[PDB]
């Protein structure tokens, strides 16, 4: 964080890389957002059967 | 230890001329595994003839097929005598030739069969060189003086084998020609007639060389045999491709632009349709739209709106087609029947048309509106999915989103329905795995339960049946007595 282009290049890290991923055992893992029903909101549904 | 005595077996490599079988999953119908003769070409990719692209429900864009090699003389013999694609041109599923001239050949066949086409001497020699069954005698040119010109129909007549007798109607056949005079002249050069294995008149298209009953290839198979049909297919493809090298085909923006008068007429039609739907929705708001019998007020309002919009899109498509130029490649591609349809021409030129999801128009996802940009409680065409603009003209964002919804519906149903059809066809084939015909010509189950006394109530296989007309049921009593 906070490093400019020069330090990132000197540090063997791509300036253009957006980041946003973890590194576990050398494999770059990225979390994916998961949808779920909104909490604390009364709904109404009509089950057909 | 390399000395070979009689009785040894040597595992040679796959030499040319050997027999193999292909397969493309999903293997939907029995056509998807035919036998082929092997040929050795450079590079690292299979290479098969184009017309086979239809039997295997395949397109040559990343598709990959299997290749099984038989490993016994008995196996090779049966595959040669049963599954070799020359002997299995016509499928018994619908007693029509699943094989068909397709893509550049078919369009080039159309442009090569027109009356206007003519060939100089050297071009005719070049075309004849690509044939294989040619007897070696250059036919008399249709034109002698001032200079020799051959007609494409004459070269095609050379291509036809034996003495075939076929009569088919071109796609753009005017219905008035049959009743009126010039019935056998056909000023539009419709009414394809093949006499004594020579092409006499008419342009060829999907309805004559395509995968249709009573097609020219169908009659070729039924009459001459199966090898001659293979030569027919190969000759057509080779010679037409090598003539297309001279003629050439293309498609571009010039084929999508229409005349300014056409644009003005199209805009006028769209404006009138929008005004009419404004009128009918005004009537609905003021409560004078009398409900259709058996239908709800909303139901009949939707039906009337859909009727108006469909009339508008049909009129726009007809106007675009009328203004569509003869040299326009879109018209050639559609009328030939290679790919595309007149509806696609209408969408490209005039109007994309109404976009609908699950049959109905765009649903009201928000509070009684389709998107935030439209006023609440609107049933106008622009605000419910209708796409006034065309692809060439470009789509505005809202209609672009609605078209995206329509395309997503296409993707979703085409992608989910394979699981159901895969289960139905597996259940059917598993049920009917054992039913077959014994040598009493009685169809029987696995445990010898007579299912049918004779196959198809007549004992006739499906590969040798044709469409015919009784010519005795329809005529009246007076006409019957007169004619018999």
């Amino acid at each position: 964080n906070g490093l400019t282009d020069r330090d990132l290049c000197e540090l063997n890290e791509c300036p253009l890389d957006p980041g946003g991923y973890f590194i576990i055992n050398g494999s770059e893992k990225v979390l994916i957002a998961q949808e779920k029903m909104a909490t604390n909101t009364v709904y109404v549904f009509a089950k057909k059967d | 230890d390399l000395h070979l005595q009689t009785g040894y077996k040597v595992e040679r490599h796959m030499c040319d001329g050997d027999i193999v079988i292909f397969n493309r999953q999903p293997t939907l119908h029995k056509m998807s595994m035919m036998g082929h003769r092997v040929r050795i070409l450079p590079w690292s990719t299979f290479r098969l003839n184009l017309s086979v692209t239809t039997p295997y429900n395949a397109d040559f864009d990343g598709d990959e097929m299997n290749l099984h090699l038989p490993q016994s003389l008995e196996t090779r013999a049966e595959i040669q005598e049963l599954a070799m694609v020359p002997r299995m041109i016509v499928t018994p599923q619908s007693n029509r030739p699943v094989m068909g001239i397709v893509q550049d050949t078919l369009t080039a066949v159309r442009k090569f069969t027109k009356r206007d086409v003519f060939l100089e001497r050297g071009e005719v020699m070049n075309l004849l060189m690509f044939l294989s069954t040619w007897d070696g005698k250059v036919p008399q040119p249709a034109i002698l003086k001032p200079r020799p010109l051959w007609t494409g129909k004459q070269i095609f007549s050379l291509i036809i084998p034996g003495h075939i007798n076929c009569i088919r109607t071109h796609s753009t056949h005017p219905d008035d020609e049959d009743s009126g005079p010039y019935k056998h002249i056909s000023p539009g050069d419709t009414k394809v007639v093949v006499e004594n294995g020579e092409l006499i008149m008419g342009i060829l298209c999907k309805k004559s060389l395509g995968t249709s009953a009573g097609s020219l290839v169908h009659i070729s198979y039924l009459e001459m045999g199966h090898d001659i049909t293979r030569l027919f297919y190969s000759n057509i493809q080779t010679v037409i491709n090598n003539w297309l090298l001279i003629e050439g085909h293309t498609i571009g923006i010039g084929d999508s632009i229409a005349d300014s008068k056409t644009y003005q007429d199209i805009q006028n039609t769209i404006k009138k349709a929008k005004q009419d739907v404004i009128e009918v929705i005004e009537k609905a708001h003021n409560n004078e739209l009398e409900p259709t019998p058996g239908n709800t007020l909303r139901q009949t309002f939707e039906n009337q709106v859909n009727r108006i919009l469909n009339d508008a899109r049909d009129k726009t498509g007809s106007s675009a087609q009328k203004s569509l130029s003869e040299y326009n490649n879109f018209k050639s591609m559609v009328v030939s029947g290679a790919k595309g349809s007149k509806i696609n021409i209408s969408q490209v030129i005039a109007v994309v048309g109404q976009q609908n999801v699950e049959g109905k128009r765009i649903p009201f996802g928000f509070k009684h509106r389709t998107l935030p940009h439209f006023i609440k409680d609107d049933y106008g065409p622009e605000s419910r999915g209708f796409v006034e603009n065309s692809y060439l003209a470009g789509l505005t964002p809202t209609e672009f989103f609605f078209h995206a919804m329509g395309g997503r519906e296409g993707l979703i149903d085409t992608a989910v329905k394979t699981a159901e059809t895969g289960y139905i066809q597996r259940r059917l084939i598993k049920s009917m795995e054992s039913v077959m015909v014994k040598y009493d010509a009685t169809v029987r189950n696995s445990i010898n339960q007579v299912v049918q006394l004779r196959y198809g109530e007549d004992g006739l296989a499906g590969e040798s049946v044709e469409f015919q007309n009784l010519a005795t049921l329809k005529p009246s009593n007076k006409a019957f007595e007169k004619k018999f």
């Binding site: - | 040929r39 050795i40 070409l41 290479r47 003839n49 097929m65 290749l67 190969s234």
Partner: protein, 49 residues
């Protein structure tokens, strides 16, 4: 019982339809210069098989 069950199982995954030798797979591209019966096969599959 789960070994003998449906897809990815004994009866349907190893007996009714089974993996077999003497086979090949690769992409397909057009070639209008071969007859209908013919087909191109490259030298690698021809040699190995």
């Amino acid at each position: 019982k789960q070994r003998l069950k449906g897809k990815e199982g004994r009866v349907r995954g190893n007996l009714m339809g089974k993996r077999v030798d003497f086979s090949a797979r690769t992409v397909i591209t057009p070639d209008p210069n071969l007859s209908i019966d013919q087909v191109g096969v490259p030298r690698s599959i021809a040699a190995n098989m």
